[PDB]
Design a protein around this ligand. Structure first.
Ligand code: ACO
Ligand code: ACO
Ligand code: ACO
Ligand code: UDP
Ligand code: UDP
Ligand code: U5P
Ligand code: NA
Lengths: 190, 192, 190
């Protein structure tokens, strides 16, 4: 019962869950699987070998290529960019050499960021606008820059935690008060 | 032949106000609340939201989404695939319509190709944002800013070439193309 | 001769060679010349004063504006960005001041990179994802960053060569055995 703009093209075979919204001039390939309550903005593209979970918000001009997997509650900001071939050359087809990109639950991919294929983006990570991610991003990490480097940690709500990057510590979300534990430089929810 | 108006493939929703002599190109979608002035150009796959005002002689290149809460004064230039935003710290599971921040671009400013403006910034008159920069703080009138994140490296004339003015302090410079005079007062540049 | 998606608009006059594929909602202007075996992805734009060679792969959301020239076997990654006016101001028409961008054979332009007009990108150069190029890129140079700086040398195959960044040296691609010579910091096939 997904609603699909009449100008969108959803190829036979594609599966789109209930309450999803597909906007103007979107193309979804027939292999694609998209969950419930998603939103796909103007000119989105989705390939065949793609799984998108529930409540995923994909803004305008995002191309979700083959070998990209988005867990539930992922946010893909305006004009952010995925890839699936690491070292493309026009003369050499590298279909068989695709690298996976996995975006874990609740991660936010800022506007106009780019993700080099092969990276995993952890749960509730936050990739600043314009960043170029070329390594794995820890759960809750705030990363910015070209290439992206970690400068802090972000709570689920989306504000920085008073927690060092390394070692062992604990902190609370400035909004909800919920506690996070850092152990050897890895952040988790308590 | 005849002058282009609004390409037939564009979708201009009922209620949109578009001024005379503006050109709207292929597969543009303009929402019903928008207002767009005279003499504007909107490139391929532009999107324009409802809560948007665009002045006169605004040139918006391909693949720019002028989302709700973005406001563009006369003579602004939005380069190819530059990107605006309206939520500072988006999370898919957190509704943030009530927390949008306005982005205001003042007269004559240039936003280079593939730059990004983090919401809430104000871009000053005749500012120049280099290609690919990421703006996350206000940009003074006439400032030339580049980089991720953007830092000021000079001052640009209205004509669009750097002025011989220091970044800080008091100074004066003249545009050699027009002879227009600029005055720097404690690091703030104005046209004389 | 090309295959053209029915939603594409290819203006009268445009020349597109055999075995080319034009995908959804692409607009090609009537002065354009595109060679054989090219692929133009979703929402590509091609201007009038444009020559694109053979086997050029142009991914989604690339606008090949007037005064951009792409040699054979060029790869333009997802949402990379060309320009033709150096210092745009909406009040001043600068058609007459366009600066050329020439991309030489086999160069790769990574996803979401940007090229400031006037640059020449050398043969088999490799511009990293997200870079902003504002100076000429040597043949075979690997450049990254905003603005782009050279960090190594890429073989035709698209893997770094065992060459110093500067100086005089030689190296061999392990995949093909082809030999490269670095002379005063200029790399060429022997
Ligand atoms: C649909 C499609 O996907 S089409 C295909 C489009 N694909 C792409 O555009 C992907 C382009 N790939 C890249 O940019 C890759 O990062 C490559 C090919 C440049 C990496 O090349 P490699 O030789 O493996 O270099 P390596 O990863 O060892 O990096 C060397 C240094 O350059 C840095 N670097 C590498 N790539 C980038 C980049 N794009 N931007 C900034 N820095 C970069 C690395 O961070 C490292 O520096 P550090 O040690 O200071 O962190
Ligand atoms: C339609 C739609 O708009 S959907 C919503 C899309 N919205 C977005 O993509 C916005 C993304 N937001 C951002 O990137 C923001 O800059 C945030 C959320 C990362 C800022 O997080 P904050 O915790 O407030 O960080 P803060 O602003 O204090 O910056 C900390 C440091 O990081 C730098 N920084 C922050 N963001 C960036 C960025 N995107 N790129 C590079 N540097 C950055 C700052 O400049 C500062 O360093 P400095 O002191 O040397 O100048
Ligand atoms: C269809 C269409 O094309 S519409 C037109 C769209 N066109 C554009 O968006 C082009 C925008 N132009 C630019 O970004 C240009 O680089 C300009 C105008 C900012 C250059 O301005 P100039 O005054 O000539 O500066 P200049 O080239 O001397 O550079 C000064 C310094 O800034 C750096 N710099 C210049 N532009 C950039 C940039 N975009 N990003 C990062 N650094 C930059 C230079 O590398 C130099 O630094 P360095 O000496 O430490 O390397
Ligand atoms: O002959 C033309 C002129 C313009 N455009 C479209 O208009 C945008 C703006 O082009 P230009 O900068 O020349 O704008 P104009 O001032 O001519 O509207 C281009 O990217 C294309 O989207 C086009 O398709 N054909
Ligand atoms: O089955 C397909 C194959 C390709 N594409 C479109 O073609 C572009 C380029 O695809 P690919 O790199 O696979 O290019 P090819 O060389 O196969 O034309 C994709 O981004 C889509 O726009 C598509 O819609 N369906
Ligand atoms: O009234 C609307 C709401 C949404 N959109 C399209 O949906 C995208 C997602 O909007 P939102 O879900 O972020 O509000 C917008 O970028 C645009 O593509 C519209 O065109 N009109
Ligand atoms: Na971009």
């Amino acid at each position: 019962m997904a609603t699909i703009h009449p100008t969108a093209i959803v190829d036979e075979g594609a599966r789109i869950g209930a309450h999803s919204r597909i906007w103007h001039w979107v193309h979804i390939c027939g292999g694609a699987e998209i969950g419930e309550g998603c939103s796909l903005g103007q000119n989105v593209f989705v390939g065949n070998r793609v799984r998108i979970g529930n409540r995923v918000k994909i803004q305008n001009n995002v191309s979700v290529y083959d070998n990209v997997f988005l867990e539930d509650d992922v946010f893909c900001g305006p004009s952010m960019v995925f890839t699936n071939v690491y070292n493309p050359r026009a003369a050499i087809e590298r279909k068989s050499e695709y690298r996976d990109t996995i975006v874990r639950q609740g991660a936010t991919l800022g506007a106009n960021c780019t993700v080099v294929c092969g990276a995993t983006i952890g749960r509730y990570a936050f990739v600043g606008a314009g960043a170029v991610v070329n390594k794995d991003v820890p759960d809750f990490a705030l990363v910015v820059g070209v290439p992206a480097r970690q400068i802090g940690w972000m709570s689920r709500h989306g504000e920085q935690l008073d927690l060092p990057l390394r070692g062992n510590a604990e902190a609370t979300c400035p909004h909800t008060g919920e506690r996070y534990i850092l152990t050897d430089g890895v952040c988790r929810l308590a």
